[PDB]
Design an enzyme around this catalytic site. Structure first.
Site, PDB file in Angstrom:
ATOM      1  CG  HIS A  40      -0.328   0.409   2.684  1.00 36.58           C
ATOM      2  ND1 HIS A  40       0.011  -0.503   3.610  1.00 36.58           N
ATOM      3  CD2 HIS A  40      -0.325   1.649   3.106  1.00 36.58           C
ATOM      4  CE1 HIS A  40       0.401   0.275   4.564  1.00 36.58           C
ATOM      5  NE2 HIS A  40       0.312   1.520   4.347  1.00 36.58           N
ATOM      6  CD  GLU A  52      18.302   9.850   6.235  1.00 35.81           C
ATOM      7  OE1 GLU A  52      18.896  10.155   7.407  1.00 35.81           O
ATOM      8  OE2 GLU A  52      18.318  10.321   5.238  1.00 35.81           O
ATOM      9  CD  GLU A  62      22.830  10.791   6.272  1.00 42.45           C
ATOM     10  OE1 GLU A  62      23.909  11.101   5.760  1.00 42.45           O
ATOM     11  OE2 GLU A  62      22.136  11.594   6.722  1.00 42.45           O
ATOM     12  CG  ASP A  84      -0.036  -3.895   2.953  1.00 42.56           C
ATOM     13  OD1 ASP A  84       0.698  -3.495   1.797  1.00 42.56           O
ATOM     14  OD2 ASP A  84      -0.207  -3.151   3.754  1.00 42.56           O
ATOM     15  CG  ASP A 168      -0.832   0.948  16.766  1.00 42.97           C
ATOM     16  OD1 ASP A 168      -0.123   0.254  16.312  1.00 42.97           O
ATOM     17  OD2 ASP A 168      -2.023   1.279  16.410  1.00 42.97           O
ATOM     18  CB  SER A 169       3.237   1.135  13.747  1.00 42.84           C
ATOM     19  OG  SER A 169       2.108   0.017  13.384  1.00 42.84           O
ATOM     20  CD  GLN A 171      -1.073   8.811  10.390  1.00 42.53           C
ATOM     21  OE1 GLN A 171      -1.610   7.782  10.582  1.00 42.53           O
ATOM     22  NE2 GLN A 171      -1.559  10.080  10.643  1.00 42.53           N
ATOM     23  N   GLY A 172       2.882   6.717   7.860  1.00 39.89           N
ATOM     24  CA  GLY A 172       4.306   7.006   7.877  1.00 39.89           C
ATOM     25  C   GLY A 172       5.295   5.997   8.396  1.00 39.89           C
ATOM     26  CB  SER A 174       2.834   2.469   5.965  1.00 39.51           C
ATOM     27  OG  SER A 174       1.769   2.790   6.532  1.00 39.51           O
TER      28      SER A 174
HETATM   29 CA    CA Z   1      20.370  11.974   7.847  1.00 44.75          CA
HETATM   30 NA    NA Z   2      18.605   5.804  13.209  1.00 48.41          NA
END
Ligand code: CA
Ligand code: NA
Length: 220
Positions: A40, A52, A62, A84, A168-169, A171-172, A174
Site C-alpha cells: 500500500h 538514516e 547515509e 500487503d 502503536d505504529s 501512517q508514515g 507503514s
Molecule cells: Ca540524515
Molecule cells: Na537511526
C-alpha cells in the site's frame, strides 16, 4: 510511532526511509540489493535512504539508492490489505557496515507474547519526527487480533502491540519493520487509526512469505 521512544542513532541499521521528495514509508533491508516494504506504500518512483537517523539532516553515513524494480505481491488486495507486501530492488547494492545491515527473514512464525521492536518516522499521534522512533511490543494471539477486527484478519496478518492503546505504529511507519528475536516477523500494514483501545496494529505476517521473497530475489 505513538507511545514510543527515540531510537539510538543507527541502532536499527536494517531500517530504511522510502523517499519521493519527502519520507512517506518505511522498509527493511533483507538483502544487499533488496528492501521489503508494504504494497500500500507503492509509488512508481522511490529513493531508498539507508543509514538514516535524522531524515532532515545530512549526517554523512547515509546511503541514498534509487529503486530499480518495485514488485508488489501478485495477490495483494487493496481492500482487505491481504498480502500487503512489496519488494524493492536497489539500483546498486547497499554497502553493509555498522550502520547499514540486513535483517534476517523469519526462521519460523513467532509465538504469541514474543517481544518485538517496531520502528519508523511515522506519526507520533511537518507531522513526522526527524528522528527514528522505536517501540517495544509483543506479538498478540491470533484470537486477540481477530476479536479486535472481526472478519478482517486473514491468515497473512498478525497483531502486534497492546489492547490498552497509546502504543502503536501509524501512517508514515507503514512498510517498516517489526523485528522479534532477530527476525523480521511483521511489516507495518494497517489498523483503525493508531494507538486506539482494542485496535492494535495489524502487520503483514512475514513468516508466510519467505519462499515468495526468495523466489523474487532469485528471478530478478
Ligand atoms: Ca540524515
Ligand atoms: Na537511526
Amino acid at each position: 510511532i505513538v507511545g514510543g521512544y527515540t531510537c539510538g542513532a543507527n541502532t536499527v541499521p536494517y531500517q530504511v526511509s522510502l523517499n519521493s521528495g519527502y519520507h512517506f514509508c518505511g522498509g527493511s533491508l533483507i538483502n544487499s540489493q533488496w528492501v521489503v516494504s508494504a504494497a500500500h506504500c507503492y509509488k512508481s518512483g522511490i529513493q531508498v535512504r539507508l543509514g538514516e537517523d535524522n531524515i532532515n539532516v545530512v549526517e554523512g553515513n547515509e546511503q541514498f539508492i534509487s529503486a530499480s524494480k518495485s514488485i508488489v505481491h501478485p495477490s495483494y488486495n487493496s481492500n482487505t490489505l491481504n498480502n500487503d507486501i512489496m519488494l524493492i530492488k536497489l539500483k546498486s547494492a547497499a554497502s553493509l557496515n555498522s550502520r547499514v545491515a540486513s535483517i534476517s527473514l523469519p526462521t519460523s512464525c513467532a509465538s504469541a507474547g514474543t517481544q518485538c521492536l517496531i520502528s519508523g518516522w511515522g506519526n507520533t499521534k511537518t507531522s513526522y519526527p526527524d528522528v527514528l522512533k522505536c517501540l517495544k511490543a509483543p506479538i498478540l494471539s491470533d484470537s486477540s487480533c481477530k476479536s479486535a477486527y472481526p472478519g478482517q484478519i486473514t491468515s497473512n496478518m498478525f497483531c502486534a502491540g497492546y489492547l490498552e492503546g497509546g502504543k502503536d505504529s501509524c501512517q508514515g511507519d507503514s512498510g517498516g519493520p517489526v523485528v522479534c528475536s532477530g527476525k523480521l516477523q511483521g511489516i507495518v500494514s494497517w489498523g483503525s487509526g493508531c494507538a486506539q483501545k482494542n485496535k492494535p496494529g495489524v502487520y503483514t505476517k512475514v513468516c508466510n512469505y519467505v519462499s515468495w521473497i526468495k523466489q523474487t530475489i532469485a528471478s530478478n
